[PDB]
Amino acid sequence: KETAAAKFERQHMDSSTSASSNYCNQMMKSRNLTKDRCKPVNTFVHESLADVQAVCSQKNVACKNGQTNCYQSYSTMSITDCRETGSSKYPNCAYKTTQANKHIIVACEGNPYVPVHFDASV
Amino acid sequence: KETAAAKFERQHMDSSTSSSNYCNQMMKSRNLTKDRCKPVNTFVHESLADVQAVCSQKNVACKNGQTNCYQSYSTMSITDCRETGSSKYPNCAYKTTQANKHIIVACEGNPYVPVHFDASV
Ligand SMILES: Cc1cn([C@H]2C[C@H](O)[C@@H](CO[P@](O)(=S)N3C[C@@H](CO)O[C@@H](n4ccc(=O)[nH]c4=O)C3)O2)c(=O)[nH]c1=O
């Protein structure tokens, strides 16, 4: 029902803000990343969908899993990293919000060829 | 530094596949407006494999007089980006034109791949 592309959007897109200390707490919950467990690490990207989708035609790089279908953004993008705290205990998942400007690396698949996985920021 | 092959892909490859704002968005996203507005740039809308294949097509002289240039046997989907007359950095402005033309690239290295966009014809 939920496509890989849609799941990527749900997990990783937040175009609506350009960059709150309680951002991650709220967003990890609202995007259903704390439902079955506390997802430990997750990145949100504050750019347009078109800008993130465009990365699939940018710098081809090796994926961390050894596949070859990963792409690094030529420009830095505004991102927020969410990382689970040490004192976090499901179901009260708690996170540190870290904002950065970094290049992103995504895995792309499909026709159309679109992001399905967030591999890293550099 | 960036390899020549990689620079070619950044500057000239867009296998994604069109707004009149396409060039404005692309020349920015590929870092072609950073210090200056690059005045003229062509993007190719074919697979990387198709463009790399041009290195085994029609051998021609390059505009610099070297003879490692190759013309595509087929026409390809391209977008020509050319700065407007009134464009002034840092607000770089481009006219986008879609076309279907043969491309000419310089090839080098191992693997033997495009390292320079010479012309569309
Ligand atoms: C590194 C990183 C990851 N993530 C998200 C994307 C994914 O939803 C999730 C896990 O991605 P990875 O860390 S690339 N991921 C892939 C996973 C199989 O699904 O396998 C994991 N793995 C692999 C080897 C290993 O030793 N340990 C481990 O946990 C790592 O975390 C994210 O949003 N931002 C990031 O910066």
PDB file of C-alpha atoms and ligand atoms in Angstrom:
ATOM      1  CA  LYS A   1       0.000   0.000   0.000  1.00  0.00           C
ATOM      2  CA  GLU A   2       2.757   2.418   1.118  1.00  0.00           C
ATOM      3  CA  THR A   3       5.342   2.561  -1.681  1.00  0.00           C
ATOM      4  CA  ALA A   4       9.086   2.643  -0.972  1.00  0.00           C
ATOM      5  CA  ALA A   5       9.040   6.176  -2.298  1.00  0.00           C
ATOM      6  CA  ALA A   6       6.211   7.191   0.041  1.00  0.00           C
ATOM      7  CA  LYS A   7       7.962   5.581   3.015  1.00  0.00           C
ATOM      8  CA  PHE A   8      11.108   7.569   2.219  1.00  0.00           C
ATOM      9  CA  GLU A   9       8.989  10.730   2.178  1.00  0.00           C
ATOM     10  CA  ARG A  10       7.381   9.843   5.523  1.00  0.00           C
ATOM     11  CA  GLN A  11      10.657   8.947   7.214  1.00  0.00           C
ATOM     12  CA  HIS A  12      12.907  11.641   5.780  1.00  0.00           C
ATOM     13  CA  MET A  13      11.154  14.658   4.176  1.00  0.00           C
ATOM     14  CA  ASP A  14      10.305  17.766   6.178  1.00  0.00           C
ATOM     15  CA  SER A  15      10.169  20.561   3.634  1.00  0.00           C
ATOM     16  CA  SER A  16       7.879  22.617   5.867  1.00  0.00           C
ATOM     17  CA  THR A  17      10.643  24.013   8.100  1.00  0.00           C
ATOM     18  CA  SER A  18      13.961  25.412   6.840  1.00  0.00           C
ATOM     19  CA  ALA A  19      15.837  23.929   9.852  1.00  0.00           C
ATOM     20  CA  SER A  20      12.796  23.485  18.463  1.00  0.00           C
ATOM     21  CA  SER A  21      14.874  21.427  20.849  1.00  0.00           C
ATOM     22  CA  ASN A  22      11.813  19.108  20.887  1.00  0.00           C
ATOM     23  CA  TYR A  23      11.692  18.742  17.079  1.00  0.00           C
ATOM     24  CA  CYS A  24      12.846  15.116  17.034  1.00  0.00           C
ATOM     25  CA  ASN A  25      10.612  14.080  19.948  1.00  0.00           C
ATOM     26  CA  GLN A  26       7.559  15.316  18.041  1.00  0.00           C
ATOM     27  CA  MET A  27       8.577  14.292  14.523  1.00  0.00           C
ATOM     28  CA  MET A  28       9.811  10.768  15.310  1.00  0.00           C
ATOM     29  CA  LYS A  29       6.388  10.214  16.939  1.00  0.00           C
ATOM     30  CA  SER A  30       4.228  11.891  14.280  1.00  0.00           C
ATOM     31  CA  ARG A  31       5.938  10.038  11.404  1.00  0.00           C
ATOM     32  CA  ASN A  32       5.329   6.718  13.155  1.00  0.00           C
ATOM     33  CA  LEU A  33       9.012   5.969  13.817  1.00  0.00           C
ATOM     34  CA  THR A  34       8.371   5.171  17.501  1.00  0.00           C
ATOM     35  CA  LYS A  35       5.399   2.841  17.042  1.00  0.00           C
ATOM     36  CA  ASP A  36       6.968  -0.636  17.293  1.00  0.00           C
ATOM     37  CA  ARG A  37      10.204   0.566  18.895  1.00  0.00           C
ATOM     38  CA  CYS A  38      12.377   3.642  19.289  1.00  0.00           C
ATOM     39  CA  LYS A  39      14.003   3.977  15.883  1.00  0.00           C
ATOM     40  CA  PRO A  40      17.600   4.830  17.000  1.00  0.00           C
ATOM     41  CA  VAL A  41      18.839   7.183  14.220  1.00  0.00           C
ATOM     42  CA  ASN A  42      16.812   9.116  11.627  1.00  0.00           C
ATOM     43  CA  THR A  43      17.430  12.113   9.371  1.00  0.00           C
ATOM     44  CA  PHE A  44      14.929  14.722   8.166  1.00  0.00           C
ATOM     45  CA  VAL A  45      15.751  16.827   5.114  1.00  0.00           C
ATOM     46  CA  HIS A  46      14.523  20.428   4.866  1.00  0.00           C
ATOM     47  CA  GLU A  47      14.498  20.893   1.115  1.00  0.00           C
ATOM     48  CA  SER A  48      11.837  20.522  -1.563  1.00  0.00           C
ATOM     49  CA  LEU A  49      10.868  17.058  -2.714  1.00  0.00           C
ATOM     50  CA  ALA A  50      12.053  17.934  -6.229  1.00  0.00           C
ATOM     51  CA  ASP A  51      15.464  18.907  -4.813  1.00  0.00           C
ATOM     52  CA  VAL A  52      15.814  15.626  -2.905  1.00  0.00           C
ATOM     53  CA  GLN A  53      14.461  13.547  -5.827  1.00  0.00           C
ATOM     54  CA  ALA A  54      17.051  15.248  -8.078  1.00  0.00           C
ATOM     55  CA  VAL A  55      19.858  13.672  -6.006  1.00  0.00           C
ATOM     56  CA  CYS A  56      19.154  10.386  -7.834  1.00  0.00           C
ATOM     57  CA  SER A  57      20.837  11.998 -10.886  1.00  0.00           C
ATOM     58  CA  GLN A  58      23.778  13.472  -8.907  1.00  0.00           C
ATOM     59  CA  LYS A  59      27.046  11.948  -7.693  1.00  0.00           C
ATOM     60  CA  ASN A  60      26.937   8.142  -7.879  1.00  0.00           C
ATOM     61  CA  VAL A  61      28.676   6.661  -4.817  1.00  0.00           C
ATOM     62  CA  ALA A  62      28.886   3.230  -3.187  1.00  0.00           C
ATOM     63  CA  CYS A  63      26.161   2.473  -0.666  1.00  0.00           C
ATOM     64  CA  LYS A  64      27.219   1.380   2.784  1.00  0.00           C
ATOM     65  CA  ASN A  65      25.728  -2.082   2.021  1.00  0.00           C
ATOM     66  CA  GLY A  66      27.968  -2.468  -1.043  1.00  0.00           C
ATOM     67  CA  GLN A  67      25.220  -1.820  -3.626  1.00  0.00           C
ATOM     68  CA  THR A  68      26.028   0.815  -6.285  1.00  0.00           C
ATOM     69  CA  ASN A  69      22.694   2.676  -6.376  1.00  0.00           C
ATOM     70  CA  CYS A  70      23.552   5.532  -3.967  1.00  0.00           C
ATOM     71  CA  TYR A  71      23.841   9.196  -4.809  1.00  0.00           C
ATOM     72  CA  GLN A  72      25.445  12.123  -3.016  1.00  0.00           C
ATOM     73  CA  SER A  73      23.975  15.650  -3.295  1.00  0.00           C
ATOM     74  CA  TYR A  74      26.284  18.136  -5.056  1.00  0.00           C
ATOM     75  CA  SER A  75      25.003  20.927  -2.771  1.00  0.00           C
ATOM     76  CA  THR A  76      24.804  20.811   1.042  1.00  0.00           C
ATOM     77  CA  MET A  77      21.243  20.526   2.335  1.00  0.00           C
ATOM     78  CA  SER A  78      19.591  21.579   5.565  1.00  0.00           C
ATOM     79  CA  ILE A  79      19.048  18.421   7.662  1.00  0.00           C
ATOM     80  CA  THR A  80      18.100  17.462  11.178  1.00  0.00           C
ATOM     81  CA  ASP A  81      19.596  14.344  12.736  1.00  0.00           C
ATOM     82  CA  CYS A  82      17.522  12.649  15.420  1.00  0.00           C
ATOM     83  CA  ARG A  83      19.386  10.307  17.756  1.00  0.00           C
ATOM     84  CA  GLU A  84      17.833   8.337  20.592  1.00  0.00           C
ATOM     85  CA  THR A  85      19.114   9.292  24.070  1.00  0.00           C
ATOM     86  CA  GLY A  86      20.615   6.863  26.593  1.00  0.00           C
ATOM     87  CA  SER A  87      17.729   7.422  29.030  1.00  0.00           C
ATOM     88  CA  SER A  88      15.104   6.785  26.304  1.00  0.00           C
ATOM     89  CA  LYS A  89      12.828   3.839  27.113  1.00  0.00           C
ATOM     90  CA  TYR A  90      10.075   2.751  24.761  1.00  0.00           C
ATOM     91  CA  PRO A  91       7.345   3.921  24.590  1.00  0.00           C
ATOM     92  CA  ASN A  92       8.624   7.320  25.723  1.00  0.00           C
ATOM     93  CA  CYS A  93      11.185   7.600  22.955  1.00  0.00           C
ATOM     94  CA  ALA A  94      13.403  10.656  23.488  1.00  0.00           C
ATOM     95  CA  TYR A  95      15.817  12.178  20.966  1.00  0.00           C
ATOM     96  CA  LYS A  96      18.539  14.791  20.531  1.00  0.00           C
ATOM     97  CA  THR A  97      17.791  17.229  17.680  1.00  0.00           C
ATOM     98  CA  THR A  98      20.944  18.208  15.747  1.00  0.00           C
ATOM     99  CA  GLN A  99      20.673  20.592  12.809  1.00  0.00           C
ATOM    100  CA  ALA A 100      23.368  20.574  10.132  1.00  0.00           C
ATOM    101  CA  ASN A 101      24.155  21.588   6.590  1.00  0.00           C
ATOM    102  CA  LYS A 102      25.596  18.552   4.886  1.00  0.00           C
ATOM    103  CA  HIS A 103      25.601  16.619   1.656  1.00  0.00           C
ATOM    104  CA  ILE A 104      23.123  13.741   1.780  1.00  0.00           C
ATOM    105  CA  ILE A 105      23.503  10.189   0.388  1.00  0.00           C
ATOM    106  CA  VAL A 106      20.343   8.314  -0.718  1.00  0.00           C
ATOM    107  CA  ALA A 107      19.671   4.981  -2.421  1.00  0.00           C
ATOM    108  CA  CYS A 108      17.371   5.220  -5.424  1.00  0.00           C
ATOM    109  CA  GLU A 109      15.271   2.573  -7.183  1.00  0.00           C
ATOM    110  CA  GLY A 110      12.320   2.265  -9.507  1.00  0.00           C
ATOM    111  CA  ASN A 111      10.731   3.847 -12.521  1.00  0.00           C
ATOM    112  CA  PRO A 112      10.566   6.741 -11.841  1.00  0.00           C
ATOM    113  CA  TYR A 113      13.998   6.544 -10.213  1.00  0.00           C
ATOM    114  CA  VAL A 114      13.445   7.960  -6.740  1.00  0.00           C
ATOM    115  CA  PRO A 115      14.928   7.907  -3.231  1.00  0.00           C
ATOM    116  CA  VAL A 116      13.980   4.864  -1.128  1.00  0.00           C
ATOM    117  CA  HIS A 117      16.657   4.945   1.597  1.00  0.00           C
ATOM    118  CA  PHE A 118      18.720   7.514   3.440  1.00  0.00           C
ATOM    119  CA  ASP A 119      22.276   6.151   3.708  1.00  0.00           C
ATOM    120  CA  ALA A 120      24.376   8.943   5.224  1.00  0.00           C
ATOM    121  CA  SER A 121      25.236  12.601   5.485  1.00  0.00           C
ATOM    122  CA  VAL A 122      28.731  13.878   4.748  1.00  0.00           C
TER     123      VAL A 122
ATOM    124  CA  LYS B   1      40.091  16.964  -6.666  1.00  0.00           C
ATOM    125  CA  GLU B   2      37.014  15.991  -8.696  1.00  0.00           C
ATOM    126  CA  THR B   3      37.936  13.585 -11.532  1.00  0.00           C
ATOM    127  CA  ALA B   4      37.313  14.768 -15.079  1.00  0.00           C
ATOM    128  CA  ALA B   5      34.689  12.040 -15.545  1.00  0.00           C
ATOM    129  CA  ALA B   6      32.895  13.153 -12.390  1.00  0.00           C
ATOM    130  CA  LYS B   7      32.975  16.820 -13.384  1.00  0.00           C
ATOM    131  CA  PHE B   8      31.474  15.813 -16.747  1.00  0.00           C
ATOM    132  CA  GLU B   9      28.637  13.972 -14.952  1.00  0.00           C
ATOM    133  CA  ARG B  10      27.973  16.928 -12.646  1.00  0.00           C
ATOM    134  CA  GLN B  11      27.995  19.500 -15.420  1.00  0.00           C
ATOM    135  CA  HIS B  12      26.381  17.579 -18.266  1.00  0.00           C
ATOM    136  CA  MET B  13      24.396  14.484 -17.174  1.00  0.00           C
ATOM    137  CA  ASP B  14      20.747  14.581 -16.164  1.00  0.00           C
ATOM    138  CA  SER B  15      19.362  11.079 -16.694  1.00  0.00           C
ATOM    139  CA  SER B  16      16.237  11.793 -14.593  1.00  0.00           C
ATOM    140  CA  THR B  17      13.922  13.320 -17.222  1.00  0.00           C
ATOM    141  CA  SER B  18      10.292  20.299 -18.180  1.00  0.00           C
ATOM    142  CA  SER B  19       9.705  23.741 -16.626  1.00  0.00           C
ATOM    143  CA  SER B  20      11.035  26.965 -18.217  1.00  0.00           C
ATOM    144  CA  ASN B  21      12.746  27.281 -14.820  1.00  0.00           C
ATOM    145  CA  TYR B  22      14.670  24.008 -15.404  1.00  0.00           C
ATOM    146  CA  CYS B  23      17.979  25.692 -16.215  1.00  0.00           C
ATOM    147  CA  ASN B  24      17.752  28.143 -13.293  1.00  0.00           C
ATOM    148  CA  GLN B  25      17.225  25.219 -10.901  1.00  0.00           C
ATOM    149  CA  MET B  26      19.857  22.985 -12.548  1.00  0.00           C
ATOM    150  CA  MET B  27      22.653  25.521 -12.945  1.00  0.00           C
ATOM    151  CA  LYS B  28      22.273  26.130  -9.187  1.00  0.00           C
ATOM    152  CA  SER B  29      21.987  22.479  -8.078  1.00  0.00           C
ATOM    153  CA  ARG B  30      25.098  21.456 -10.067  1.00  0.00           C
ATOM    154  CA  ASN B  31      27.185  24.293  -8.557  1.00  0.00           C
ATOM    155  CA  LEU B  32      27.417  26.202 -11.868  1.00  0.00           C
ATOM    156  CA  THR B  33      26.398  29.562 -10.370  1.00  0.00           C
ATOM    157  CA  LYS B  34      28.674  29.583  -7.310  1.00  0.00           C
ATOM    158  CA  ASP B  35      31.407  32.118  -8.075  1.00  0.00           C
ATOM    159  CA  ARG B  36      29.993  33.251 -11.414  1.00  0.00           C
ATOM    160  CA  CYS B  37      27.150  32.416 -13.750  1.00  0.00           C
ATOM    161  CA  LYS B  38      28.458  29.758 -16.134  1.00  0.00           C
ATOM    162  CA  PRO B  39      27.115  31.345 -19.376  1.00  0.00           C
ATOM    163  CA  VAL B  40      26.344  28.240 -21.431  1.00  0.00           C
ATOM    164  CA  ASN B  41      25.805  24.628 -20.408  1.00  0.00           C
ATOM    165  CA  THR B  42      24.183  21.566 -21.991  1.00  0.00           C
ATOM    166  CA  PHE B  43      22.506  18.742 -20.050  1.00  0.00           C
ATOM    167  CA  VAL B  44      22.027  15.312 -21.580  1.00  0.00           C
ATOM    168  CA  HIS B  45      18.856  13.299 -20.857  1.00  0.00           C
ATOM    169  CA  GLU B  46      20.111   9.835 -21.667  1.00  0.00           C
ATOM    170  CA  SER B  47      21.434   7.039 -19.484  1.00  0.00           C
ATOM    171  CA  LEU B  48      25.056   7.321 -18.392  1.00  0.00           C
ATOM    172  CA  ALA B  49      25.612   4.041 -20.263  1.00  0.00           C
ATOM    173  CA  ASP B  50      24.306   5.582 -23.501  1.00  0.00           C
ATOM    174  CA  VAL B  51      26.548   8.622 -23.166  1.00  0.00           C
ATOM    175  CA  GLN B  52      29.615   6.546 -22.239  1.00  0.00           C
ATOM    176  CA  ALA B  53      28.928   4.497 -25.366  1.00  0.00           C
ATOM    177  CA  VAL B  54      29.622   7.610 -27.483  1.00  0.00           C
ATOM    178  CA  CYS B  55      33.329   6.908 -26.776  1.00  0.00           C
ATOM    179  CA  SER B  56      33.025   3.962 -29.207  1.00  0.00           C
ATOM    180  CA  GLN B  57      31.172   5.924 -31.916  1.00  0.00           C
ATOM    181  CA  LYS B  58      32.255   8.433 -34.554  1.00  0.00           C
ATOM    182  CA  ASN B  59      35.811   9.668 -33.986  1.00  0.00           C
ATOM    183  CA  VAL B  60      36.178  13.391 -34.785  1.00  0.00           C
ATOM    184  CA  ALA B  61      38.610  16.204 -33.986  1.00  0.00           C
ATOM    185  CA  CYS B  62      37.879  18.324 -30.917  1.00  0.00           C
ATOM    186  CA  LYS B  63      37.556  22.127 -30.967  1.00  0.00           C
ATOM    187  CA  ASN B  64      40.962  22.317 -29.228  1.00  0.00           C
ATOM    188  CA  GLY B  65      42.509  20.238 -32.063  1.00  0.00           C
ATOM    189  CA  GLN B  66      43.038  16.976 -30.132  1.00  0.00           C
ATOM    190  CA  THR B  67      41.542  13.902 -31.820  1.00  0.00           C
ATOM    191  CA  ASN B  68      39.990  12.098 -28.844  1.00  0.00           C
ATOM    192  CA  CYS B  69      36.499  13.419 -29.604  1.00  0.00           C
ATOM    193  CA  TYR B  70      33.496  11.356 -30.534  1.00  0.00           C
ATOM    194  CA  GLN B  71      30.168  12.224 -32.080  1.00  0.00           C
ATOM    195  CA  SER B  72      27.077  10.270 -31.089  1.00  0.00           C
ATOM    196  CA  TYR B  73      25.672   8.288 -33.964  1.00  0.00           C
ATOM    197  CA  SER B  74      22.137   8.968 -32.698  1.00  0.00           C
ATOM    198  CA  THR B  75      20.492  12.211 -31.656  1.00  0.00           C
ATOM    199  CA  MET B  76      19.947  12.571 -27.919  1.00  0.00           C
ATOM    200  CA  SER B  77      17.519  14.478 -25.728  1.00  0.00           C
ATOM    201  CA  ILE B  78      19.388  17.568 -24.462  1.00  0.00           C
ATOM    202  CA  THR B  79      18.572  20.822 -22.674  1.00  0.00           C
ATOM    203  CA  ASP B  80      20.544  23.922 -23.678  1.00  0.00           C
ATOM    204  CA  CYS B  81      20.989  26.471 -20.888  1.00  0.00           C
ATOM    205  CA  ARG B  82      22.100  29.924 -21.924  1.00  0.00           C
ATOM    206  CA  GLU B  83      22.317  32.930 -19.659  1.00  0.00           C
ATOM    207  CA  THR B  84      19.899  35.762 -20.506  1.00  0.00           C
ATOM    208  CA  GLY B  85      21.231  39.136 -21.585  1.00  0.00           C
ATOM    209  CA  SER B  86      20.115  40.731 -18.336  1.00  0.00           C
ATOM    210  CA  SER B  87      21.443  37.973 -16.017  1.00  0.00           C
ATOM    211  CA  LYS B  88      23.763  39.279 -13.325  1.00  0.00           C
ATOM    212  CA  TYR B  89      25.455  37.232 -10.623  1.00  0.00           C
ATOM    213  CA  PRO B  90      24.459  36.215  -8.033  1.00  0.00           C
ATOM    214  CA  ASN B  91      20.950  36.122  -9.497  1.00  0.00           C
ATOM    215  CA  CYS B  92      21.902  33.902 -12.438  1.00  0.00           C
ATOM    216  CA  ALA B  93      19.141  33.656 -15.043  1.00  0.00           C
ATOM    217  CA  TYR B  94      18.952  31.220 -17.959  1.00  0.00           C
ATOM    218  CA  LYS B  95      16.759  30.503 -20.912  1.00  0.00           C
ATOM    219  CA  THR B  96      15.965  26.776 -21.105  1.00  0.00           C
ATOM    220  CA  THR B  97      15.744  25.219 -24.581  1.00  0.00           C
ATOM    221  CA  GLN B  98      14.913  21.572 -25.250  1.00  0.00           C
ATOM    222  CA  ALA B  99      16.517  19.970 -28.276  1.00  0.00           C
ATOM    223  CA  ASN B 100      17.308  16.628 -29.936  1.00  0.00           C
ATOM    224  CA  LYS B 101      20.848  16.688 -31.331  1.00  0.00           C
ATOM    225  CA  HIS B 102      23.990  14.637 -31.726  1.00  0.00           C
ATOM    226  CA  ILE B 103      26.530  15.323 -28.955  1.00  0.00           C
ATOM    227  CA  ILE B 104      30.324  15.521 -29.257  1.00  0.00           C
ATOM    228  CA  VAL B 105      32.426  14.623 -26.216  1.00  0.00           C
ATOM    229  CA  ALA B 106      36.114  14.136 -25.470  1.00  0.00           C
ATOM    230  CA  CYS B 107      36.957  10.736 -23.995  1.00  0.00           C
ATOM    231  CA  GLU B 108      39.919   9.789 -21.818  1.00  0.00           C
ATOM    232  CA  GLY B 109      41.198   7.473 -19.138  1.00  0.00           C
ATOM    233  CA  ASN B 110      40.468   3.918 -18.070  1.00  0.00           C
ATOM    234  CA  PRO B 111      37.628   3.244 -18.303  1.00  0.00           C
ATOM    235  CA  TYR B 112      37.470   5.332 -21.481  1.00  0.00           C
ATOM    236  CA  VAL B 113      34.665   7.754 -20.712  1.00  0.00           C
ATOM    237  CA  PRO B 114      33.553  11.340 -21.471  1.00  0.00           C
ATOM    238  CA  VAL B 115      35.622  14.025 -19.797  1.00  0.00           C
ATOM    239  CA  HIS B 116      34.456  17.102 -21.754  1.00  0.00           C
ATOM    240  CA  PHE B 117      31.374  18.226 -23.635  1.00  0.00           C
ATOM    241  CA  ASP B 118      32.577  19.653 -26.942  1.00  0.00           C
ATOM    242  CA  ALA B 119      29.343  20.553 -28.818  1.00  0.00           C
ATOM    243  CA  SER B 120      25.869  19.533 -29.871  1.00  0.00           C
ATOM    244  CA  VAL B 121      25.295  19.242 -33.608  1.00  0.00           C
TER     245      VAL B 121
HETATM  246  C1  LIG C   1      23.215   6.546   9.177  1.00  0.00           C
HETATM  247  C2  LIG C   1      21.769   7.010   9.069  1.00  0.00           C
HETATM  248  C3  LIG C   1      20.701   6.190   9.013  1.00  0.00           C
HETATM  249  N1  LIG C   1      19.428   6.652   8.926  1.00  0.00           N
HETATM  250  C4  LIG C   1      18.257   5.691   8.888  1.00  0.00           C
HETATM  251  C5  LIG C   1      18.033   5.031   7.535  1.00  0.00           C
HETATM  252  C6  LIG C   1      17.456   3.679   7.898  1.00  0.00           C
HETATM  253  O1  LIG C   1      16.061   3.818   8.057  1.00  0.00           O
HETATM  254  C7  LIG C   1      18.072   3.363   9.272  1.00  0.00           C
HETATM  255  C8  LIG C   1      19.178   2.335   9.305  1.00  0.00           C
HETATM  256  O2  LIG C   1      20.111   2.637   8.215  1.00  0.00           O
HETATM  257  P1  LIG C   1      21.633   2.169   8.236  1.00  0.00           P
HETATM  258  O3  LIG C   1      22.329   2.789   9.443  1.00  0.00           O
HETATM  259  S1  LIG C   1      22.474   2.705   6.543  1.00  0.00           S
HETATM  260  N2  LIG C   1      21.332   0.404   8.231  1.00  0.00           N
HETATM  261  C9  LIG C   1      20.789  -0.548   7.269  1.00  0.00           C
HETATM  262  C10 LIG C   1      20.274  -1.720   8.081  1.00  0.00           C
HETATM  263  C11 LIG C   1      19.400  -2.684   7.336  1.00  0.00           C
HETATM  264  O4  LIG C   1      18.141  -2.028   7.154  1.00  0.00           O
HETATM  265  O5  LIG C   1      21.424  -2.399   8.591  1.00  0.00           O
HETATM  266  C12 LIG C   1      21.992  -1.590   9.612  1.00  0.00           C
HETATM  267  N3  LIG C   1      23.257  -2.196  10.104  1.00  0.00           N
HETATM  268  C13 LIG C   1      24.178  -2.712   9.195  1.00  0.00           C
HETATM  269  C14 LIG C   1      25.354  -3.228   9.596  1.00  0.00           C
HETATM  270  C15 LIG C   1      25.685  -3.245  11.008  1.00  0.00           C
HETATM  271  O6  LIG C   1      26.727  -3.690  11.504  1.00  0.00           O
HETATM  272  N4  LIG C   1      24.720  -2.705  11.853  1.00  0.00           N
HETATM  273  C16 LIG C   1      23.505  -2.164  11.478  1.00  0.00           C
HETATM  274  O7  LIG C   1      22.716  -1.710  12.304  1.00  0.00           O
HETATM  275  C17 LIG C   1      22.335  -0.168   9.130  1.00  0.00           C
HETATM  276  O8  LIG C   1      18.550   4.641   9.818  1.00  0.00           O
HETATM  277  C18 LIG C   1      19.131   8.005   8.840  1.00  0.00           C
HETATM  278  O9  LIG C   1      18.033   8.465   8.711  1.00  0.00           O
HETATM  279  N5  LIG C   1      20.210   8.835   8.886  1.00  0.00           N
HETATM  280  C19 LIG C   1      21.516   8.427   8.944  1.00  0.00           C
HETATM  281  O10 LIG C   1      22.381   9.298   8.988  1.00  0.00           O
END
